[PDB]
Amino acid sequence: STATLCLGHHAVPNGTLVKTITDDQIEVTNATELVQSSSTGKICNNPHRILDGIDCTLIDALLGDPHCDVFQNETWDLFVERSKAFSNCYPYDVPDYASLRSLVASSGTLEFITEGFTWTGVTQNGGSNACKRGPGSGFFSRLNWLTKSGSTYPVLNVTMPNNDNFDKLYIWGIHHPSTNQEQTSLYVQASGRVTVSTRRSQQTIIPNIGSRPWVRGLSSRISIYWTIVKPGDVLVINSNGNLIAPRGYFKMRTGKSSIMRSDAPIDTCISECITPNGSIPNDKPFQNVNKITYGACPKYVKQNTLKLATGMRNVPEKQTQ
């Protein structure tokens, strides 16, 4: 009398295909997905402080476009810019707009400190019907439109020392009138100039006269510039016309703040990773949702699926007829 002892392994009726160095297609017993390919379509407001810009770009919030007044002294981990955003103040452009947007977004804050600037010989608080705040004409909340007083516009020459321990960000502008008549009615001189300087940097802009396309009533433009002042250093503003003056500085920070263009709705939920598509889970090493991410996110990858085998090769059972 004898006995038969067989050794064998399990197999399933529902196998799944994976890749190896050798095969494009091996059936194994079990597998797990490594590519996150789905999003709810919503951005979770936990744990990152999400700031919905609504109808305002970060730049328009920075300057003080009236319908963006709600964003004064605001902070964020991630600023969200909507496609529905619109400017509704003075027609403006920003040379190297992208850099200004970037540095402010990274700073993560619109904390503004008003400074006691003194503008002798000139009229202050200029307004326009292109930039209404309330019933009447107005202007960027953070900017001061300076014009002639009487029949004179003197050479402005002012100082603001930084005796703090942080960097000051100064936002200022230059007015480009559309006519020589406009150029002499506001600032008297035939051609103005704006010089803003620290001890190691200077920017002089000469305003340009010319008709630009009609925008909110106007063919004139304002060009926006910025200046960072380090501790110990000092700001000097010199101009004989066309100065769009700062009212103080923005406090600069370093940290984890950024900005994202997305139309995804903000939702009360929890997620570390944010894409413009919406929040995605971070349990998988890879994701195919968006190359644009913020936070603890899986690495973006071109594959929509990568299957990691979690079981042995699936081998069918033999039966002789």
Binding site: T4, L5, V301, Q303
Partner: protein
């Protein structure tokens, strides 16, 4: 209609093994039985879990980066930005592809290995009391009831007690 006959792992799986990854089937005096081997099953599962917990762990946290979509044509700087991101993405896509290929190849190999290791250990226990049929099964050359089979499975089989009975069946 060959029924009741059992066969081992050689080019053959068991769909009826549900409480383990590896195990035993036997035919003796008391009929036919099956039992899973927890040790080998556990060994494989642990290795699978080790690899999984190395890959699924430690997400990279990133914050302010570069812009990756653009509403205006600009030229040189934007060319460089897109090229940087495209370079990065192709390299991570490659790492992802290579990673799963290596891991899956190794997964299949380590699971085959566990099966073979269980087979070798069982043969080691049996000494001269059994012969390899060449289908992943042993022919035990002595009376081996359910308690005898179990002693092989739980690793306490005493080959001396059956040795003489086995040699006579094998050789004479």
């Amino acid at each position: 209609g060959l029924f009741g006959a059992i066969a081992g792992f050689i080019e053959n799986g068991w769909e009826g093994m549900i409480d383990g990854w590896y195990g035993f089937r036997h035919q003796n005096s008391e009929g036919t039985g099956q039992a899973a081997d927890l040790k080998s099953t556990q060994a494989a599962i642990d290795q699978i879990n080790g690899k999984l917990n190395r890959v699924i762990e430690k997400t990279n946290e990133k914050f302010h980066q570069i812009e990756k979509e653009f509403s205006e044509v600009e030229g040189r700087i934007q060319d460089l930005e897109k090229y940087v991101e495209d370079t990065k993405i192709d390299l991570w896509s490659y790492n992802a592809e290579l990673l799963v290929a290596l891991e899956n190849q190794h997964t299949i190999d380590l699971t085959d290995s566990e099966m073979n290791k269980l087979f070798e250990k069982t043969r080691r226990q049996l000494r001269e009391n059994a012969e390899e049929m060449g289908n992943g099964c042993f022919k035990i050359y002595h009376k081996c009831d359910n308690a005898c089979i179990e002693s092989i499975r739980n690793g306490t089989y005493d080959h001396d007690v059956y040795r003489n009975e086995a040699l006579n069946n094998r050789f004479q």
